[PDB]
Write a protein that binds this ligand. Structure first.
Ligand SMILES: Cc1c(C)n(Cc2ccc(Cl)c(OCC(=O)O)c2)c2ccc(C(=O)NCc3ccc(C(C)(C)C)cc3)cc12
Ligand SMILES: Cc1c(C)n(Cc2ccc(Cl)c(OCC(=O)O)c2)c2ccc(C(=O)NCc3ccc(C(C)(C)C)cc3)cc12
Lengths: 263, 256
């Protein structure tokens, strides 16, 4: 069965690769200057953004204020992320054989956590990759947006730095992501047995992958599990904010229906 | 590996030495394993009337008031326990203070599960039982205050941890790298990294049936935090309203 856990691990990595265009390896390149291919357009102050939008050209333009056009771009891209993560989750052994109600429940509450995890791979302490890699937006500029949106992006940076210090690679993350999805304590799951049975195989595969790939750091597995509560914390804070954008900010119907804050 | 069993034993020893009401003892009282231990139930107002003569300001207030003064005696207790943990005394004194004052809520609720079942919680050092319903039949603000504790407890007690596990887990909680205000997090993580090494082995030997117990326990921190937040949120609504939530010298210095 040691031989199985190694293949569950290789299985998830391929799908992870097929499911997610912008991998951590590919991000970490763009960030360091590791390739001689392209380089990110940078967004450091109010000036830089102006010029950015022309050369960079985004998908989420909606012909508002700057800080709103960012938030919503974040949300557009997260709706994109959901479909990628929805594809990935189908590849996890057993998952599709689950009750459809549970499938939906698991994704519904899983996706925020998986987005913040993957966002860590696009960040360093100084900013974050945007627009499928082609841009870079500084942490300072994000911290300088107006009263509500100044703190928006900051908890994720705090987490990212802590998280990225574990130095995980995509193969480790592909298994970590499967674990978050198959979290058998989502509200309203109908049949928790097969969910935990699968989570149990995934943890065993994760545990083993971490040992072989990161032998130098003992209790990396435990360190990683602790970060699920960090992830979970960032989500309650994000729901805290979404409530005070509903209550204070003013917004098309079909745009707020595409970007339906699930809960 | 055998040097980790040694550490587990040390912690379990100082755990028993530091806390008078073990899980073990509480389970006996709640099951009636020999009946000189049988607790007095409080489930209504005449029961509470009778129970002040029986056991060791408005009524719902005076519950919360005693419910808080029991927690300061719990901090006294947790501080002793921390001091027994290899390394903790060697840290920057300021970190000691910090490390505790954040961890004390999280450990309280962990140990309070040991006092709890579906229907109620033990009070007055084991001597009493107070009903989940009678707790949540207090007229607000206080009618919501114990109910999230019961929710965590039932799902936490699910794991069936015995005291020799709770001791190590509670060590893990105290020594959190992620606390705000820590000068040297590095040494803090060096200890926790071993504690975790110890908790893992412990849980395979004591619970060999349970395959991902290690993982499933560590995951409970999320609930354990969620409940801690709700406590102060609530404790600040009472703050400006209630006359007069008066405080001990160890109450006030935790958040103000
Ligand atoms: C996936 C993702 C990325 C790549 N970023 C980085 C980012 C930062 C800044 C900008 Cl202007 C940005 O522009 C969009 C783009 O370049 O594609 C992207 C996120 C910044 C924030 C978030 C985020 O907080 N998502 C929360 C969220 C929002 C909505 C959902 C739904 C309702 C779709 C399920 C989930 C999670 C997600 C992302
Ligand atoms: C330790 C503890 C017990 C044994 N109970 C159950 C309980 C319920 C009802 C009553 Cl009347 C009660 O009486 C006290 C007693 O039994 O002697 C005990 C808690 C019920 C609630 C809480 C609780 O929510 N404590 C939170 C808290 C409050 C203050 C702190 C400080 C600020 C001192 C650090 C931490 C945590 C703790 C306990």
């Amino acid at each position: 069965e040691s031989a199985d856990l190694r293949a569950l691990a290789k299985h998830l990595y391929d799908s992870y690769i097929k499911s997610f265009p912008l991998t951590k390896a590919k991000a970490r390149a763009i960030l360091t200057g590791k390739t001689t291919d392209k380089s990110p357009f940078v967004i450091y102050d109010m000036n830089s953004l102006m010029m950015g939008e022309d050369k960079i050209k985004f998908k989420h333009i909606t012909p508002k204020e700057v800080a709103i056009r960012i938030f919503q771009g974040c949300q557009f891209r997260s709706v994109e992320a959901v479909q990628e993560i929805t594809e990935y989750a189908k590849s996890i052994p057993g998952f599709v054989n689950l009750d459809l109600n549970d499938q939906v429940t698991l994704l519904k509450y899983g996706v925020h956590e998986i987005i913040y995890t993957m966002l860590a791979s696009l960040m360093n302490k100084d900013g974050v990759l945007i627009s499928e890699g082609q841009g870079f937006m500084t942490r300072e500029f994000l911290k300088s947006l107006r009263k509500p949106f100044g703190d928006f992006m900051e908890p994720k940076f705090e987490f990212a730095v802590k998280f990225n210090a574990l130095e995980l690679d995509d193969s480790d993350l592909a298994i970590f992501i499967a674990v978050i999805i198959l979290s058998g304590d989502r509200p309203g799951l109908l049949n928790v047995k097969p969910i935990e049975d699968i989570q149990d195989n995934l943890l065993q595969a994760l545990e083993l992958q971490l040992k072989l790939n990161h032998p130098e750091s003992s209790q990396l597995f435990a360190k990683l599990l602790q970060k699920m509560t960090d992830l979970r914390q960032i989500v309650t804070e994000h729901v805290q904010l979404l409530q005070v954008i509903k209550k204070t900010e003013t917004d098309h119907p079909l745009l707020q229906e595409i970007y339906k804050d699930l809960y």
